[PDB]
């Protein structure tokens, strides 16, 4: 199918390559297979039910609310260019050292970094202000994204030092990720909602920290994973981090608005020490509505 | 130089292209030149210029302000990379399309995007809290980079595609920071802090509107522009995005807190119409510190 050159003659007993001169790009290295049929077989059974999720999870966001619908919007239009060009250039570069980049993973990632990583900083939804911890959380996220490209593009040496920039910014990121769910989980009412934060805190580290894991495994790094076991791992990671997480996101909202609509916004003064955090208990209780230094 | 195969003999006159078979990559498309000479002659001036404006920034900045020593810091990094691998992969990514796609520009533009836009809310450095715009102008700003990023990578109708949803995310992200820059102009005291907030406007959408113009000239459009050609053109814009708006902005911040050194924090309520907006008016006299709904 290939709109690259993948017609040749080897000469001089293969010492020699002769192609026709049609201006068409050739490298031996972009024709490897991307897997077994089995593997291929996996990963388009799992494609259609991320679809079908994608799917389920905007008509029901139908029924404030923009970062879940968005990240369902970019994993939508994903699919449909999956359907029809997931091999073709630029959903994969093909590039002059014999690369395959999946560019269309980086794109949705960079895309959605900004729209999950705000949504980090609301998961109750009450706030209409972002602190100066969300804003190094963006930076430093986008910094991860952008080394780890340049590391999937590169080489050798130059692949194993982005890959190290990649890591540090990212070990920023999740330290910082860690005290907003922290936060989040002495904020909200005592019940159902802090199972969800636990939830959402569990998804996020579990998902986030295997990417990293499946670029070390995949073309990018030691070549362990083909790439149609790559996908088949990357929409299982998808499902969790993209279509589950603001699933979980919008049920977490729709509780604490309700909060809001029963008992009423009742904040409390939780002075957390994991250093000297404070935070704004919302409590089911009149009453209370006092200073708690609960000094962990 | 390069480290793609660049030697070949024509056969069957000029039909066939034989190449050692060296598993290097080759397609002609990558080796058109970058330019004249007097182009790279220009392009190598104005680089070190770049170095020369991004290494006194930094000094500068060493006698909170995090934003622009950070954009020196990428740009002085920048151009060590370009003075030894400037057009070596992944710096240029040459792809199975014939494509040259200048990595190294887009990178540094998504890793100090969110400092820049941060920086953007943040022009008197007197916040601690970022408003819900801000994060519209990261999720918008972030996808026009990605869009366009897609679209140099790609050619024909999804090139076109891609730069017009580039466009329109951008058009959002112009629209939206305006608004900004107004809240800005009448929060700050009335002397000589208007005035670079005034310069800072001119000198963001001066620089931010001509990259979309070098983009539709450059290879990645209608190859109007060289190599070079377009290198010289970026390191102007680069100069006036990067250095001097930082620059500005480290100043402005200087002149806002030494108020506060002076006068003190004595905010006023300028309800703006340009719709139904508030501000909180900085003024060097105590007497002031009441409501002046300013209806534009
Ligand atoms: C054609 O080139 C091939 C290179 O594979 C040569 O085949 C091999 O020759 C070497 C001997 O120098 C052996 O070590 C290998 O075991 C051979 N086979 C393979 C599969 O590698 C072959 O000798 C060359 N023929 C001519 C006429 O030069
Ligand atoms: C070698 O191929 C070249 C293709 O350029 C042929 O040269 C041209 O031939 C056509 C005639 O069909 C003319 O229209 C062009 O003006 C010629 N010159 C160029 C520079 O394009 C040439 O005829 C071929 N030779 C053989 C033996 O087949
Ligand atoms: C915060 C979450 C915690 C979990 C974080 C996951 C840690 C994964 C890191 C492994 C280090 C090993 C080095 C990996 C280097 C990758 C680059 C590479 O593959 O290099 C190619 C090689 O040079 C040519 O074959
Ligand atoms: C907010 C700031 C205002 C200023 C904003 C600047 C506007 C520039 C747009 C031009 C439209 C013309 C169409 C450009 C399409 C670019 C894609 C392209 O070059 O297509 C390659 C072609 O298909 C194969 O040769
Ligand atoms: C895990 C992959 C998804 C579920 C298994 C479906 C599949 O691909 O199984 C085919 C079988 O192995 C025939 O080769
Ligand atoms: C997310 C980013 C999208 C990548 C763009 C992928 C879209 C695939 C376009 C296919 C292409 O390159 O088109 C060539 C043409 O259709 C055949 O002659
Ligand atoms: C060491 C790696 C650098 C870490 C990545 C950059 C950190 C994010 C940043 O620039 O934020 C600084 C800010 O001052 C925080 O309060
Ligand atoms: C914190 C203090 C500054 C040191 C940080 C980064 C060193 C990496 C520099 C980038 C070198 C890129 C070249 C490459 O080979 O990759
Ligand atoms: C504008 C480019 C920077 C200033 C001009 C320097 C330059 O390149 O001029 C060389 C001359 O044109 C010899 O061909
Ligand atoms: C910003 C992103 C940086 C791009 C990385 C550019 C760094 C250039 C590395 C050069 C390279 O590919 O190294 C090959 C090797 O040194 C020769 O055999
Ligand atoms: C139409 C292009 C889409 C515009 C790009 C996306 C807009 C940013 C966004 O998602 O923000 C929505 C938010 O609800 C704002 O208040
Ligand atoms: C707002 C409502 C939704 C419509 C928005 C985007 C259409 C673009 C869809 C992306 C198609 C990419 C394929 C390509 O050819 O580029
Ligand atoms: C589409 C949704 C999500 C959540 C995508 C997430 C991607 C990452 C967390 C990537 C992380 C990386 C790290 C931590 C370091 C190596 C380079 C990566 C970009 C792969
Ligand atoms: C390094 C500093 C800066 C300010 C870089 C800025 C880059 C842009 C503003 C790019 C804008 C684009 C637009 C508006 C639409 C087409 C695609 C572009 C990414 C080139």
Known sequence: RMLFQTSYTLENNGSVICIPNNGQCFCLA??????????????????????????????????????????????????????????????????????????????????????????????????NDYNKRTMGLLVSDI??????????????????????????????????????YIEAYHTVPKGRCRQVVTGMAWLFFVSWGMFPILFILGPEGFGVLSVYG?????????????????????????LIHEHILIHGDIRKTTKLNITEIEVETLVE??????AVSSED
Chains 1, 2 share one sequence.
């Open 30 to 127: 972009w024709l490897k297979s991307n897997g077994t049929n089995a593997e291929k077989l996996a990963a388009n059974i799992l494609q259609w039910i991320t679809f079908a999720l994608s799917a389920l999870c905007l008509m029901f966001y139908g029924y404030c609310g923009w970062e879940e619908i968005y990240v369902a919007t970019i994993e939508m239009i994903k699919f449909i260019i999956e359907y029809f060009h997931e091999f073709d250039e630029p959903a994969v570069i093909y590039s002059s050292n014999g690369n395959k980049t999946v560019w269309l993973r980086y794109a949705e990632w960079l895309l959605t970094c900004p729209v999950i990583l705000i949504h980090l900083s609301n998961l109750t939804g009450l706030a």
């Open 143 to 180: 910094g991860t994204i952008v080394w780890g490209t340049t590391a999937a593009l590169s080489k050798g040496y130059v692949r194993v030092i982005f890959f190290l920039m990649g890591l540090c910014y990212g070990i920023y990121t999740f330290f910082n990720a860690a005290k907003v």
């Open 230 to 254: 790559s996908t088949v791992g990357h929409t299982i990671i998808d499902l969790m981090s993209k279509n589950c997480w603001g699933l979980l996101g919008h049920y977490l909202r729709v």
């Open 285 to 290: 209780d009149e009453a209370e509505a006092g």
